[PDB]
């Protein structure tokens, strides 16, 4: 399916890139396709919590 | 009791420093090439 | 004043910004955003322009 | 007891020195050849 990776994160926003190359930016309450509703943006440690229980991170060899 | 006032002085210096740091906004620079 | 290469150095830790670049043939300038202080550092970024 | 305050003064000078040393970031230099 599609996998999203953190490109940049500040307090408040997060810029994500997908495996198709599309780029998005999100805030605390926002819609993400295929993942659900954003519950918490943690600027430290690079973790994004999602309503489906998933955690959005950096690519492992690109981080 | 007097600790409120010593704290007021270090805090006053720090808050004045913070607000003067928040005041400055600098003009943008445009570069022309040929 | 003639090439196609910019050299950027960040001066502050976490202050972030933006930049506008106008090329030779293009009329629309290309605007980019610049974020310092991440868990990765972009040593070199290559950009494909549409035109 | 008073040793906390003498220690505060040598430590204050050293920490101020450390933070002012951590503040400076210098501009890069580009060299052109022909």
Q: Calculate how close chain B gets to C7, using CA atoms only, in Å.
A: 14
Report resolution in angstroms: 3.8
| Coil, helix or strand at residue B10 | helix
Named by the residue before each, gaps in chain A exceeding 2.5 A from C to N are none
Q: Please give the DSSP secondary-structure letter assigned to residue A63.
A: -
D27 touches chain C (CB under 8 A): yes
Chain A partners within 8 Å of C38 (Cβ): 8-9
Q: Calculate how close chain D gets to C48, using CA atoms only, in Å.
A: 25
Question: Going by C-beta distance under 8 Å and a sequence separation of 6 or more, which residues neighbour residue C9?
Answer: D27, D28
Query: Which of C14, C16, C34, C35 to mutate: most A Cβ within 10 Å?
Result: C35
Sheet containing A4-9, strands listed edge to edge, beginning at the edge strand earlier in sequence: A4-9, A14-18, A23-26
């Amino acid at each position: 399916r599609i996998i999203y990776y953190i490109q940049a994160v500040i307090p408040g926003r997060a810029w994500l890139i997908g495996s198709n190359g599309s780029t998005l930016t999100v805030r605390e309450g926002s819609k993400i396709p295929g993942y659900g509703m954003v519950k918490l943006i943690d600027s430290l440690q690079g973790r994004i919590l999602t309503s489906s229980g998933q955690v959005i991170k950096f690519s492992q060899e690109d981080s | 009791q007097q600790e409120i006032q010593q704290r007021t002085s270090d805090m006053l210096t720090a808050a004045t420093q913070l607000v003067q740091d928040w005041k400055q906004v600098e003009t943008q620079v445009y570069t022309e090439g040929t | 004043k003639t090439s196609n290469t910019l050299m950027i150095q960040a001066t502050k830790l976490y202050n972030y910004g933006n930049l506008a670049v106008r090329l030779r043939g293009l009329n629309t300038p290309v605007m980019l955003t610049l974020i310092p202080g991440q868990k990765a550092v972009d040593y070199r970024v290559d950009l494909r322009v549409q035109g």
